[PDB]
């Protein structure tokens, strides 16, 4: 059971590097005890080896993560960026991907990961919802994301 709270959702200031985005989004998970204390270091080392950026169509998406051994409780942290931040395309691509929205996934089970990639593909495909994410505030994007994953969960079963 993944834990999604308002505290995990946040807006990030401009002129912020990818490293700082990782540490900032992992900070609430570390404080809650959802992950290990140095969870951000394993995420960025994973991020350098395997790019997690996805192009989509309205906005860009990032899916940072790490091995399941470091995660203690399943969680998800969402970050909204005021200006596009460079992220390398997942799967391998020379041209960079301008990622506006970042989805940090901490999952303790390897088999659950594929289902959460399918949830993410579903929500990011909606062109109007991705572009409305930017204008909505933290509480508005949290409730919309919560409602959509809850809707997606009842459709999965």
């Amino acid at each position, epitope marked *: 059971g993944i834990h999604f709270r308002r505290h995990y959702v946040r807006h990030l200031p401009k002129e912020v590097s990818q490293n700082d985005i990782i540490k900032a989004l992992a900070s609430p998970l570390i404080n809650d005890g959802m992950v290990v204390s140095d969870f951000a270091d394993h995420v960025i080392t994973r991020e350098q*080896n*395997f790019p*997690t950026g996805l192009p989509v169509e309205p906005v860009g998406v990032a*899916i940072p*993560h790490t*091995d*399941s051994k470091y995660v203690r409780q399943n969680a998800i942290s969402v970050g909204i960026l005021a200006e596009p931040v460079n992220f390398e395309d*997942a*799967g*391998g691509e020379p041209d960079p991907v301008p990622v506006r929205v970042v989805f940090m996934l901490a999952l303790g*089970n*390897w*088999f659950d*990961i*594929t*289902k959460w*990639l*399918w949830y993410i*593909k579903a929500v990011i495909q909606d062109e109007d919802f991705m572009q409305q994410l930017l204008v909505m505030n933290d509480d508005e994007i949290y409730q919309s994301i919560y409602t959509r994953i809850s809707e997606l969960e009842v*459709l*999965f079963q």
Partner: antibody
Amino acid sequence: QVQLVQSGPEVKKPGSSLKVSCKASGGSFSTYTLSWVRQTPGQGLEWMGGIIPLLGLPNYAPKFQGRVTFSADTSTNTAYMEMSRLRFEDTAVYFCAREGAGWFGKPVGAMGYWGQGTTVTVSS
Amino acid sequence: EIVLTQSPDTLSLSPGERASLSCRASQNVRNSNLAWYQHKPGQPPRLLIYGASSRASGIPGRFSGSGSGTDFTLTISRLEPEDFAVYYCQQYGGSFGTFGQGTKVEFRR
């Protein structure tokens, strides 16, 4: 439909290195897991592990963590299993299996689509 | 490690009869992450049922799955010549997946 085509039969000497390929002709398996199941002569199926192609995140069964390595290429839709220091015990038939998809492409978790299998013989 | 044991080892039945296959786990299978496969000589294993009871696409109405926790069952209401094969159960609730020993169903004469 979506199908998985594996490499041909291989006979290798003890202490050699093996590499098996599995291409998904049908569709991109980037979103779904790709697992490897072996079966030794007169025995049952055995789960070696799997790879998440888009993320590149592998999972190894504790029995195969040391000598087996999984990988996958998303541009050619082909997965690979490497095994160094082949043994007589490694003689088996090796299967690749893509994760099944439910209605509207929901990943079920089980291995829905299977390759035809590759016979691997280790002998002097 | 989650270990799976299947019973019986060999099930001897005639077409038209009802087949019951048992799969038991040492620990509770997480989220009922179990699957039933059918393996015939010279063919790749065919997925029959995923999860506790969910049926894979294309499988006839005969095959049905039941169970939760540590006990699980595969039931074939009606048997036909095609159904005679070896059947495996696999769990994917643990951190790594494991298979069962398998149960062979054979024609009885």
